[PDB]
Amino acid sequence: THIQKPATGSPLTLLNGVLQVPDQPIIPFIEGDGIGCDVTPAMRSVVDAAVAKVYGGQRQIAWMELFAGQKAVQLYGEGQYLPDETMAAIREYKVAIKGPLETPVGGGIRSLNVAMRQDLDLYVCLRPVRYFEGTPSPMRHPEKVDMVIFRENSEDIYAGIEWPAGSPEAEKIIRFLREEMGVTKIRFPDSSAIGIKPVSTEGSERLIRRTIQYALEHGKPSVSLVHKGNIMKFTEGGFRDWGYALAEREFAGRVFTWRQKAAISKAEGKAAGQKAEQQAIADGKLIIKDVIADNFLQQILLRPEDYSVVATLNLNGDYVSDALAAEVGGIGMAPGANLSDTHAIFEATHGTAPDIAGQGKANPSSLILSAVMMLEHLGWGEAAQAIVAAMNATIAAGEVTGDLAALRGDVPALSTTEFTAALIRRF
Amino acid sequence: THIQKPATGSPLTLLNGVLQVPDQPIIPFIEGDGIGCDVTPAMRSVVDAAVAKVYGGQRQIAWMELFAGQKAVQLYGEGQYLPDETMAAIREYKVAIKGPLETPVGGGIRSLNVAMRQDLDLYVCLRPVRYFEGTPSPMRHPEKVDMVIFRENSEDIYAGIEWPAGSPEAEKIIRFLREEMGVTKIRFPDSSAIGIKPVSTEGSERLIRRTIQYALEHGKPSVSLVHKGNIMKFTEGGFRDWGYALAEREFAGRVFTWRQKAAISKAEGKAAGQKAEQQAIADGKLIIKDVIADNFLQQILLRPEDYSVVATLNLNGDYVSDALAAEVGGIGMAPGANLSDTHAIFEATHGTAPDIAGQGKANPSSLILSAVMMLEHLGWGEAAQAIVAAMNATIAAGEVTGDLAALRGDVPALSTTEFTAALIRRF
Ligand SMILES: NC(=O)c1ccc[n+]([C@@H]2O[C@H](COP(=O)([O-])OP(=O)(O)OC[C@H]3O[C@@H](n4cnc5c(N)ncnc54)[C@H](O)[C@@H]3O)[C@@H](O)[C@H]2O)c1
Numbered sequence: 048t049h050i051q052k053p054a055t056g057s058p059l060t061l062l063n064g065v066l067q068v069p070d071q072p073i074i075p076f077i078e079g080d081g082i083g084c085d086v087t088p089a090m091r092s093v094v095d096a097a098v099a100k101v102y103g104g105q106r107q108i109a110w111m112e113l114f115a116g117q118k119a120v121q122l123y124g125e126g127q128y129l130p131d132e133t134m135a136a137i138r139e140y141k142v143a144i145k146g147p148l149e150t151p152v153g154g155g156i157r158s159l160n161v162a163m164r165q166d167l168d169l170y171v172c173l174r175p176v177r178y179f180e181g182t183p184s185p186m187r188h189p190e191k192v193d194m195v196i197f198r199e200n201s202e203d204i205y206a207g208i209e210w211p212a213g214s215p216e217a218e219k220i221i222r223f224l225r226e227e228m229g230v231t232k233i234r235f236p237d238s239s240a241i242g243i244k245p246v247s248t249e250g251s252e253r254l255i256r257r258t259i260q261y262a263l264e265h266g267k268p269s270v271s272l273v274h275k276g277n278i279m280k281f282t283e284g285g286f287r288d289w290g291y292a293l294a295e296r297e298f299a300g301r302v303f304t305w306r307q308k309a310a311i312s313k314a315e316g317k318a319a320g321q322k323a324e325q326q327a328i329a330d331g332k333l334i335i336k337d338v339i340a341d342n343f344l345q346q347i348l349l350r351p352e353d354y355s356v357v358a359t360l361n362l363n364g365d366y367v368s369d370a371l372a373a374e375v376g377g378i379g380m381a382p383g384a385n386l387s388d389t390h391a392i393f394e395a396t397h398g399t400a401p402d403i404a405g406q407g408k409a410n411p412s413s414l415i416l417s418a419v420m421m422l423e424h425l426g427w428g429e430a431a432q433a434i435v436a437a438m439n440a441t442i443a444a445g446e447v448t449g450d451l452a453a454l455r456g457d458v459p460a461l462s463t464t465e466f467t468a469a470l471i472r473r474f
Numbered sequence: 475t476h477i478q479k480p481a482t483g484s485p486l487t488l489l490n491g492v493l494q495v496p497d498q499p500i501i502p503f504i505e506g507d508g509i510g511c512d513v514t515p516a517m518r519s520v521v522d523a524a525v526a527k528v529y530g531g532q533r534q535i536a537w538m539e540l541f542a543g544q545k546a547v548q549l550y551g552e553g554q555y556l557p558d559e560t561m562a563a564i565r566e567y568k569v570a571i572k573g574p575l576e577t578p579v580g581g582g583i584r585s586l587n588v589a590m591r592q593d594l595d596l597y598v599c600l601r602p603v604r605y606f607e608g609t610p611s612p613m614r615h616p617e618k619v620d621m622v623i624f625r626e627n628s629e630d631i632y633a634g635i636e637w638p639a640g641s642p643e644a645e646k647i648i649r650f651l652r653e654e655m656g657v658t659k660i661r662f663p664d665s666s667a668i669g670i671k672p673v674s675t676e677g678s679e680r681l682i683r684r685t686i687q688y689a690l691e692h693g694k695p696s697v698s699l700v701h702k703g704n705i706m707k708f709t710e711g712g713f714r715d716w717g718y719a720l721a722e723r724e725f726a727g728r729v730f731t732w733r734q735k736a737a738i739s740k741a742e743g744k745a746a747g748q749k750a751e752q753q754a755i756a757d758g759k760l761i762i763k764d765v766i767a768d769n770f771l772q773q774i775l776l777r778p779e780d781y782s783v784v785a786t787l788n789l790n791g792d793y794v795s796d797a798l799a800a801e802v803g804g805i806g807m808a809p810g811a812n813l814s815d816t817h818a819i820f821e822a823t824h825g826t827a828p829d830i831a832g833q834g835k836a837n838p839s840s841l842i843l844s845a846v847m848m849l850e851h852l853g854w855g856e857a858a859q860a861i862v863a864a865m866n867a868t869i870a871a872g873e874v875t876g877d878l879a880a881l882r883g884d885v886p887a888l889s890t891t892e893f894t895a896a897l898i899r900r901f
């Protein structure tokens with residue numbers, strides 16, 4: 048072992064439904080590769096300051112370092128990118144927050160980020176994207192972005208099921224596809240690498256159910272199912288169809304969907320369909336609609352105001368998260384949470400930022416905002432709100448890191464530590 | 475048969491492997507579903523007006539209507555969405571232009587758009603995206619967008635290989651994957667639909683070769699290989715790696731890749747790597763770089779000015795095209811061409827737009843600009859340049875269709891017909 052349980056902490060526990068949160072909870076954290084070394088300490092400093100301010104010391108996070116990535120390899124030895132004790136500790140402690148981890152391209156280890164999500168079955172990747180007043184942005188009207196993305200986190204092509212071109216394995220699956228499955232559409236079978244995309248009714252349903260539940264509980268006007276269901280009919284189109292079906296049987300009478308709208312239109316005409324939709328909106332009924340993924344990218348740029356909650360697949364969610372984050376300053380302003388029904392790993396949308404690593408420039412806001420989601424998860428709402436208020440005031444005053452300052456000629460950059468200080472001095 | 479060879483036209487021919495264009499070329503066209511009924515007649519009018527003007531009546535397109543989609547079904551019979559005679563005609567006449575075609579979601583027919591591309595092996599989907607001065611845009615600085623997308627058009631998950639959840643076929647492939655391929659990562663094997671993603675060395679290579687050739691002959695500063703090769707290591711990561719290898723092998727002394735840069739950064743440090751790139755740019759070398767797909771979506775929004783030519787896979791290309799189009803007004807300002815080494819089908823980036831079909835509102839600019847590409851393909855550059863000049867002037871004058879008028883206040887909306895007339899008055 049290379050991990051040490053805090054001396055004054057007490058673990059979170061689960062008791063007949065409820066998550067029990069001690070006043071000095073043990074919260075595991077992973078530093079992260081690259082800019083993890085800048086953003087994690089900043090996040091802890093900010094969280095600690097907020098908590099001390101709002102509760103007077105009655106409460107205090109008992110941080111416990113766990114290891115993964117390069118820091119793990121250096122401490123545990125070669126190939127020890129994800130030590131067993133790391134995963135065991137997260138299971139036991141039920142919550143954790145992590146900086147980014149490096150995943151190599153074209154070869155090397157499988158994503159540790161994805162591996163953690165799979166191992167703990169954290170099937171919801173939850174990413175709220177909203178505009179902080181005054182944030183430098185490439186958009187004319189970034190304030191019109193206020194969305195919540197529910198990204199399926201356990202399946203899709205992220206499963207990591209693939210074989211390299213020319214390998215015995217690729218030849219073996221290509222032969223099965225052509226000889227046993229009757230596949231005729233592989234263009235270049237002699238040099239094809241092959242990837243598998245599993246998308247299930249069970250996986251789609253649990254993600255979409257949580258999405259609708261959230262939308263209803265928070266008074267959100269709509270849920271958009273985004274998919275490329277015309278080309279990927281049974282996977283992505285399945286996601287959409289299973290989604291509408293679930294909405295209409297588990298939430299009958301509490302939602303109005305575009306599937307229902309189509310039924311009304313087919314039988315009574317467009318006007319009737321439109322009228323029924325207008326009546327639902329008038330009723331405070333949650334609207335469930337759907338958008339093809341490419342057009343979705345167009346719509347969130349042209350009219351983001353028309354969207355609220357989004358339910359989508361793993362790959363689509365990844366791409367949408369980045370496009371949307373860019374509208375509000377980039378992935379330095381983009382928090383996230385990986386949730387199952389019992390556990391949670393809080394984690395920024397961004398990666399290791401190799402181009403600024405070691406320079407003390409990175410925006411810690413995404414991770415800080417992820418810690419906000421964590422505090423909300425812990426029921427420490429007042430601390431959470433204190434951080435959001437401080438963040439709102441800091442950005443509005445024009446105190447920002449370099450990723451934001453680069454977007455406007457009239458805004459200078461602050462280092463990671465300078466920004467952290469600017470935020471904390473406002474508590 | 476339900477088609478007719480025009481009375482006064484002559485087919486395109488060849489001479490030493492080079493396209494020979496008669497003064498009255500036979501050019502097949504397909505109207506398209508939905509707004510195809512608006513945009514196709516508009517494109518023909520504009521093209522005819524430009525040709526009549528610049529060549530003083532010495533030249534004239536002999537349009538030949540071919541059928542696909544709904545129009546084909548009503549004419550040829552139920553199920554006849556893509557008559558064999560349509561594809562044979564395009565093979566015969568070598569160049570065609572088509573309106574959008576409807577592809578159902580979650581079932582129904584396989585995409586006719588993809589089917590045409592596959593049938594004629596039009597492996598390059600070429601989509602130039604640039605800003606027309608004065609176009610309403612959601613961006614603060616849309617003028618910074620000037621890119622050319624090369625989207626692989628023959629493989630990837632677009633092959634249409636998949637089987638539905640619960641089906642005997644899905645059960646069959648899942649069993650083979652788990653029992654014979656050793657696959658353990660399928661989360662819900664009992665209810666998964668399965669899609670297959672083939673990406674090959676041969677397919678990736680010919681698309682990337684065409685991209686680099688284009689970049690070099692048009693004097694572009696860089697080619698960006700966009701991929702999600704950290705998660706899809708052997709397909710998308712293969713695309714990247716094969717791309718760098720081909721560049722260095724086939725265009726040595728004309729390019730400088732980040733693969734080369736990485737090597738210099740390893741042996742001599744990053745300062746040496748940056749210097750080498752600086753000198754390559756000074757030397758007039760084409761830079762070959764790469765960007766992970768999600769980050770690329772962020773970057774084309776934050777700093778599009780850093781990108782020029784893009785080479786990417788089928789699915790990524792589809793998503794990137796819509797996001798980039800939105801920056802310059804939407805997919806109503808986004809032309810395209812499907813190209814093999816011998817044949818070409820020109821086609822807008824947009825779909826059938828059911829929300830405005832039948833209303834005479836559609837922006838015909840995408841299809842018109844696709845015909846501009848067609849005219850350049852035919853070596854009728856003067857007519858191509860005339861349409862561009864009329865387009866530049868008409869947009870700058872504030873004379874636009876509803877899709878653009880919606881992006882900015884105090885800008886009236888012209889109908890398709892009205893916009894068409896406005897363009898034509900510049901001739
Ligand atoms: N959850 C995760 O741990 C996670 C997420 C995304 C990427 N990654 C990994 O990160 C590595 C690098 O990938 P990449 O370069 O495509 O993406 P990246 O997110 O690391 O960097 C992309 C761009 O965004 C900028 N950026 C990201 N975070 C920033 C911050 N907080 N402050 C200021 N600028 C920031 C970077 O400077 C860079 O220019 C890859 O190995 C990838 O697998 C990990």
Ligand SMILES: NC(=O)c1ccc[n+]([C@@H]2O[C@H](COP(=O)([O-])OP(=O)(O)OC[C@H]3O[C@@H](n4cnc5c(N)ncnc54)[C@H](O)[C@@H]3O)[C@@H](O)[C@H]2O)c1
Pocket residue numbers: 277338339342509573574575576577578587805806821822823824825826827828829830835836837838840877
């Ligand atoms: N190459 C093609 O033939 C092609 C391309 C994309 C989509 N499609 C098909 O089109 C159908 C509709 O798909 P969708 O609704 O997701 O996308 P779409 O491109 O048809 O429409 C998306 C949005 O963009 C707007 N839009 C598109 N073209 C426009 C134009 N020229 N002028 C003004 N507004 C325009 C529409 O009004 C709509 O709001 C689907 O069946 C899809 O398969 C075909």
